[PDB]
Amino acid sequence: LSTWQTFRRLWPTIAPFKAGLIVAGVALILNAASDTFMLSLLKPLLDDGFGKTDRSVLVWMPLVVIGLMILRGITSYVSSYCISWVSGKVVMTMRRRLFGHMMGMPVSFFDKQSTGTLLSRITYDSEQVASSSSGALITVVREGASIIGLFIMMFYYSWQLSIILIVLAPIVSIAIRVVSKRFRNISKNMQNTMGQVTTSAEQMLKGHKEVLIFGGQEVETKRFDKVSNRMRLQGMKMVSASSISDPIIQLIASLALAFVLYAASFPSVMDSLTAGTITVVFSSMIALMRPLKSLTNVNAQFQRGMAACQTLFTILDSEQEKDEGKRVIERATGDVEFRNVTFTYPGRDVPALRNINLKIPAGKTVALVGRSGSGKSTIASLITRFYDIDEGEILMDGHDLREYTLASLRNQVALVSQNVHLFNDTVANNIAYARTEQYSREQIEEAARMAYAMDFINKMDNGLDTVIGENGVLLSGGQRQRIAIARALLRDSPILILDEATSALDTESERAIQAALDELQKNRTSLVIAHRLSTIEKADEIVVVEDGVIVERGTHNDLLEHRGVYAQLHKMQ
Amino acid sequence: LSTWQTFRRLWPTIAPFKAGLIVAGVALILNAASDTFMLSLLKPLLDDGFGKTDRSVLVWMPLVVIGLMILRGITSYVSSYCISWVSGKVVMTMRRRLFGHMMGMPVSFFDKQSTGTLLSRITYDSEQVASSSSGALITVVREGASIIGLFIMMFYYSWQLSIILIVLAPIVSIAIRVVSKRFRNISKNMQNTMGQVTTSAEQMLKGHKEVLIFGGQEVETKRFDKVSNRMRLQGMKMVSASSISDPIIQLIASLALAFVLYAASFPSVMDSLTAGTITVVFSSMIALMRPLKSLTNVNAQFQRGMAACQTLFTILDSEQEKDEGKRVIERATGDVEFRNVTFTYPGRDVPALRNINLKIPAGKTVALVGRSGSGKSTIASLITRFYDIDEGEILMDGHDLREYTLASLRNQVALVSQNVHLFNDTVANNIAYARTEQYSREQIEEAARMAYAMDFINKMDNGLDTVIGENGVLLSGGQRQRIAIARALLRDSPILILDEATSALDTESERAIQAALDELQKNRTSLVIAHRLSTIEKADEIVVVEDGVIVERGTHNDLLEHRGVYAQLHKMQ
Ligand SMILES: CCCCCCCCCCCCCC(=O)O[C@H](CCCCCCCCCCC)CC(=O)O[C@@H]1[C@@H](NC(=O)C[C@@H](CCCCCCCCCCC)OC(=O)CCCCCCCCCCC)[C@H](OC[C@H]2O[C@H](OP(=O)(O)O)[C@H](NC(=O)C[C@H](O)CCCCCCCCCCC)[C@@H](OC(=O)C[C@H](O)CCCCCCCCCCC)[C@@H]2O)O[C@H](CO[C@]2(C(=O)O)C[C@@H](O[C@]3(C(=O)O)C[C@@H](O)[C@@H](O)[C@@H]([C@H](O)CO)O3)[C@@H](O)[C@@H]([C@H](O)CO)O2)[C@H]1OP(=O)(O)O
Ligand SMILES: CCCCCCCCCCCCCC(=O)O[C@H](CCCCCCCCCCC)CC(=O)O[C@@H]1[C@@H](NC(=O)C[C@@H](CCCCCCCCCCC)OC(=O)CCCCCCCCCCC)[C@H](OC[C@H]2O[C@H](OP(=O)(O)O)[C@H](NC(=O)C[C@H](O)CCCCCCCCCCC)[C@@H](OC(=O)C[C@H](O)CCCCCCCCCCC)[C@@H]2O)O[C@H](CO[C@]2(C(=O)O)C[C@@H](O[C@]3(C(=O)O)C[C@@H](O)[C@@H](O)[C@@H]([C@H](O)CO)O3)[C@@H](O)[C@@H]([C@H](O)CO)O2)[C@H]1OP(=O)(O)O
Ligand SMILES: CCCCCCCCCCOCCOCCOCCOCCOCCO
Ligand SMILES: CCCCCCCCCCOCCOCCOCCOCCOCCO
């Protein structure tokens, strides 16, 4: 994309805020008129001096000065506020769009991505668009208008002396194009290195205990020194590009003044031009040099937001998770059936699942038994369509999972596990997450009571109104699991995927969690990734998965009689 | 801290780079001299006009113009590069200092802190110091020098007319102080809101699967909309503060011109002052208006980096982990002994451990068995002094853990667990992490072979030179655990803390891990947080912990005969 093609994509997110641009332009025009009036009123005083001015006017001069200063202040405030308003609105819109697009990405997208990269895209890359939104555009318009008006003036006074403008405009245009490409390249490099800095800090924070145990504060110091210096040198590249471009443009511009002075040294080429137009033309190019410098100065900021806009639009054109299904399931009252389901993780060679033929009958419990890495977690992820299967089909209520909408499909499945993510909000808002307007406080309290969680909630500062989250008031593993059980009871999801806890907690918490899960939770179509023999023995059907295939299936007594894999696994339990 | 007190703290990190400031100042002086010479050479041409100048001079005029433009370009490049160089060096120094300080903080510091806050401090707050490092200082010096020189000229020409300056300077000073405080407050608010934005995006990327399962893309959209708009409105507060401050300062300054014009309206006050000094004084105040505006404009940036500096220095004055011990242990050849150790986690009311009397003999293995949350993980954390015990003492080779240096103490302990943090580096560099210069490639390969890890390492692209990490080429749970076993074998740490895996892997990986851990690892002073009965039966001593107290201790057969906690614990196994 060229600097015009990417700007036309950025215009639709500035159009809702073009009223600020219009008001800023009107205020700037008023300010220019006031300054012109001030200069007209002030030139006699500065040039001729005091004494040649009428005394009566001098009495009213201070009030005029104060009023003109007040008008200038009002217009300046209006212009600055409107420009910054448009810039901030555009930056906020870009941030929200990036956040929503990241929210719509597939689960596989986040495995190949680093968190620091996305964080820098939201926090750093979006801010760089601010320049090319309001301030740079207005500056470009003003300086271009000044340059065009000066060109028309120069060709009106002397067209022959102005052929140097036709000679030199392509040169400055070429230089501006070259340095604009350079600016965009440097800006993209800076964005990448900012993401790298964020990632390096994140990796130090995530492995801080490993840095303490093994030492290596020195090696991490050097590793971060490299990235910090890389960001420093990228900024230096930007500065050097700007500081080399501006003087070169100014020198090419002054080539015109040099040509005019050389032409004015010829008596033959001096009397024809009356020696009065030459002075006007020379002053015109002198006045032309300044807006050119302003334009080249604003070009660097404009190309830093054009490079950010290009990256942001490339991100916003990415492929989100496929939602081509149109059916809307209300309640899954049927059986979840796997029909020859073969799945391979993206980027991996060996399939995680091979020819899986698994049925979960309605209202029954199926226990997935197997070692770590066998594929039970893959089955759980495929049921909720976090990944799409390569071959086969998974049927919910007799229809394939890819035919239902993602929202309606995921409204049917409840995921209960020891590891619970707590959203930064109140406890009741966590129990009724995404459905606060649907469930009342009485229903929330009933669900929390049924999940055996009211005791610890009532032992807090505000009970159900205590603001909890991952950052702040947190809960132990049992308490968050009971909160998840309360959420699943309130939602009343027909299908339950239970990822069992590998380690038992204290007797009270264990008893409460077991009572909740047994009496209240497990009365629906349940698939449990089980870990303790007790829950295996209480399951309606047991499926043994080894190396991505099902090697055994049946009940506890049946599989004990078969003396298969489950026999040995129950033995070592 | 006042704006002068926080600047004197920032000066020592600019002093290493004052050569850039000096060179920038010299280049600016040369540029001013060149501009003065150019103006002296240019005024006759613009005012008198062409035709009144010597033709011989006009012959050499274009070359003079080209040379002056080249000189201006060179000086401008030098000044800009030096200013930006100093600013970038200071920003990089601040980033490195923040990174090292965060790296030196205690483990308890990171439980009360959000990752996004620290990330924003490194990435955003450090950058805001750039303005107040080189560019703002030079601008302040230049404009202050201009203002002071204009004041001296004004009192030289007419001291009586200049009393208005003495009257109006306190007013502008008071206004500047007020708006400087406002700028610093707004900047601190903006830093806080940037941290809030980074945490909100980071929390959505951590609960993305919970957002998909429960819906709530709408609620997360609104939650991020609030923070985005908060950052928008903070930036707009900054803009409004600047745009209200500057016109008010300009109006107070123009009050002096109003006073001069009012005084000039009296023939008594005009004939006495010769009516020629009044014009000079008026022109002087008009010329003085501009540097005041430049100073007020640069004040906003200066106060955004003064606020950033204040926050950064408050962070850098924080308390790191205590290292008051002076003994240096070379190799722990004795017993780790707990003597009445009572520990409470920071912020928690109930103690995590109570009256722990635990001895780990040299070259022996002790198995810690208990429910999750009992305190075994707390014991493991206390051995490595991630936390300091409230009461009692822990003896390493007969001396308390608080008497040794942290580095020497942690050189004695090796932590092996299923969850392994992979530093972004080659496999051999991970095995020899922090000790690459000490161990050769032959030793690394021998350790990897002994850890039964040479197979899958040879099954990679570059073997031991393949760059792995948390972001990029990752490894399964068994592979990183075997890499950690290889690291611990290479380091040959006398004391081993083994946090056992709660779930078995496939047959090959499980067999390799068990062989490595048994034959090679477990031949030293080992403390195992065990999970499988087989490990318990192979341990030299067993300790059972409930509710942070040891309830039963002995051997496998002894504890079976005791019919205590371990009897039941083995029973449901
Ligand atoms: C073409 C013709 C026109 C056509 C029609 C228009 C066309 C379209 C226009 C396009 C552009 C659209 C722009 C827009 O549409 O803009 C709108 C404005 C609406 C009007 C637009 C149409 C206009 C129609 C025509 C009107 C006119 C007829 C709203 C907005 O944008 O801004 C709104 C802001 N409004 C202003 O800023 C007024 C502000 C902006 C208005 C913009 C005007 C320019 C553009 C308009 C175009 C103009 C056309 C002509 O005008 C001013 O000032 C005027 C000052 C004059 C300056 C003169 C200059 C010098 C004079 C000459 C000198 C010689 C508003 O600020 C609030 C206060 O901020 C500071 O106090 P604080 O301390 O911070 O509290 C200021 N304190 C200051 O000191 C300012 C500064 O320090 C000055 C320092 C200077 C120091 C000088 C020292 C001097 C010393 C003396 C010397 C010794 C104070 O100012 C004031 O006091 C003003 C003060 O009296 C003025 C004083 C008098 C004048 C002084 C000079 C006199 C001198 C002369 C002497 C001769 C100001 O009141 O905040 C909300 C958002 O916040 C909220 C909300 O409450 O609404 C709350 C927020 O809640 C939370 C949160 O969640 O975060 C949680 C809460 O618990 C809480 O924590 C809060 C928050 O943090 C708490 O602090 O936050 C959240 O709910 C949020 C929503 O999320 C949003 O969605 O909403 C913004 O809304 P938003 O946009 O929805 O976000
Ligand atoms: C008082 C008197 C003095 C007393 C003594 C001094 C006192 C103390 C001074 C205080 C201040 C200290 C400052 C300092 O101390 O400064 C030092 C400088 C050392 C000198 C200081 C003392 C000086 C003594 C006296 C000398 C003089 C006698 C080093 C530094 O700071 O900068 C060093 C940089 N040097 C410069 O930039 C020269 C640069 C800077 C020098 C600074 C001077 C100013 C300050 C000095 C004070 C001056 C005193 C008087 O001077 C210039 O230019 C001059 C240009 C002239 C401009 C004239 C203006 C106009 C004229 C008038 C016109 C009318 C260096 O750049 C490299 C190249 O960058 C771009 O190419 P790239 O494409 O990006 O590769 C530029 N390409 C450009 O196009 C520039 C730009 O586009 C221009 C676009 C413009 C477009 C215009 C279009 C026009 C169209 C035409 C019209 C149609 C190219 O420039 C050049 O081509 C230059 C070019 O020929 C010039 C051309 C001729 C002139 C043109 C004009 C002619 C026109 C006139 C016509 C009449 C430049 O060569 O990079 C290293 C770091 O990188 C490395 C390293 O290799 O060293 C590698 C890095 O590795 C990695 C990584 O890990 O990241 C991994 C790698 O695999 C790889 O990936 C790399 C990297 O990414 C790969 O790309 O990165 C890592 O290892 C890192 C360490 O980590 C650091 O620790 O080190 C920096 O070192 P660092 O500081 O250690 O970091
Ligand atoms: C002496 C001072 C005078 C000040 C004058 C100020 C003028 C204010 C003008 C405001 O600037 C707005 C300029 O932006 C206009 C950009 O238009 C782009 C339109 O292109 C749309 C192309 O299609 C986009 C569809 O995606
Ligand atoms: C001393 C003269 C100063 C003139 C200043 C003029 C500044 C203009 C800079 C604009 O640069 C924009 C670069 O974009 C390229 C413009 O697009 C060119 C389209 O192609 C035109 C084809 O015409 C060729 C005729 O030679």
Ligand SMILES: CCCCCCCCCCOCCOCCOCCOCCOCCO
């Ligand atoms: C017409 C243009 C002329 C340009 C002149 C440019 C002058 C260059 C001056 C460079 O600026 C440096 C100013 O900074 C000096 C700050 O000094 C602070 C010293 O205070 C130290 C106090 O103790 C600190 C100990 O912690």
Ligand SMILES: CCCCCCCCCCOCCOCCOCCOCCOCCO
């Ligand atoms: C129309 C006149 C324009 C003059 C411009 C002057 C600008 C100076 C602004 C500097 O502001 C800095 C604010 O810091 C306060 C300075 O410290 C004051 C120390 O106390 C001095 C005590 O003297 C009191 C005499 O009244």
